[PDB]
C-alpha cells in the first residue's frame with residue numbers, strides 16, 4: 001500500500017519556464033492554478049498526484 005498516503009498536504013511546487021517541459025495553455029480565458037502550465041514534467045506532476 002504505497003497509495004495515496006499523502007492525502008491533503010497542500011504543497012508548493014516551483015518551476016522555471018523552459019521550452020519543451022512547461023507551456024501555457026493556449027486558450028482565451030486567463031490561466032489560473034495548475035492550468036497555467038502544461039508539459040512533460042507537469043504530466044509527471046499529474047501522475048505523482
Ligand SMILES: *[C@@H]1O[C@H](CO)[C@@H](O[C@@H]2O[C@H](CO)[C@@H](O)[C@H](O)[C@H]2NC(C)=O)[C@H](O)[C@H]1NC(C)=O
Nearest residue numbers: 001002003004005006007008009010011048049
Ligand atoms: C486528510 O484529512 C481528512 C480529514 O480532513 C482525514 O480524514 C480521516 O481519515 C480516517 C482514515 O481512516 C477516517 O477514519 C476518519 O473518519 C477521517 N476523518 C475525517 C474528519 O474525515 C484524512 O486521514 C487525511 N489524510 C491523511 C493522509 O492523513
